[PDB]
Amino acid sequence: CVIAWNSNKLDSKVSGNYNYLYRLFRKSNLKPFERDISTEIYQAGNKP
Amino acid sequence: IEKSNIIRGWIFGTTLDSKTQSLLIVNNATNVVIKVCEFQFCNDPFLD
Amino acid sequence: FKNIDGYFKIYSKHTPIDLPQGFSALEPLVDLPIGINITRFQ
Ligand SMILES: *[C@@H]1O[C@H](CO)[C@@H](O)[C@H](O)[C@H]1NC(C)=O
Ligand SMILES: *[C@@H]1O[C@H](CO)[C@@H](O)[C@H](O)[C@H]1NC(C)=O
């Protein structure tokens, strides 16, 4: 089962919150039920 | 094929370093400890 | 040792005695929800 609900009054601040982060770049697609917490920069070129 | 319990445990992971995840299974004569953490290794892993 | 769908499974057996010629089975003993990427072991 998947449950979703609203938390506007619990996760909204006038100055803005930045505690919640997501990931945008990765080399390969993710296996089901897998967790990765790496921090290495995305190698788009040759020089590290 | 063993006598006197020389073989102790096992390590599983990707690169076996302080960077990414690692599983340790140790059997130090008292209980079967399974521990999955972010763990550091040396080049000569041994136990007394 | 097997690892599928984010689950780690361990079967084991012990017996008294090159490997001997005989037949025996193994019983399930560990299942864990580890869910990581495993490639090399020690
Ligand atoms: C050693 O054995 C004790 C027994 O209580 C256990 O608590 C501990 O985690 C074990 N340590 C290792 C490294 O296996
Ligand atoms: C697991 O790690 C290896 C090591 O580089 C990598 O090649 C592989 O793509 C990883 N698994 C997945 C599903 O990305």
**Which residues in chain C are contacts of B45 at CB distance < 8 A?**
42
CB B12 within 8 A of CB B2: no
Q: Using an 8 Å Cβ cutoff, are B9 and C35 in contact?
A: no
Place of tokens 């788009």: A44
User: Which tokens hold the place of B37?
Assistant: 């953490």
CB of C25 closer than 8 Å to CB of C13 = yes
Cβ count within 10 A of residue A34 = 11
Contacts 24+ apart (CB under 8 A), A32-40: A32/C5, A32/C6, A33/C5, A33/C6, A33/C35, A34/C6, A34/C35, A34/C36, A34/C37, A35/C35, A35/C36, A36/C37, A38/B19, A38/B20
Strand-pair partners of B24: B11, B35
Q: How far lies B44's CA from each of A21, B14, B47, C16, in Å?
A: 38, 18, 10, 31
Query: Which resolution, in Å, applies to this structure?
Result: 3.0
> Which ligand 2 atom minimizes the distance to the CA of A29?
14
For ligand 2, pick from A23, A27, A28 the residue to mutate: most ligand atoms within 8 Å of CB: A28
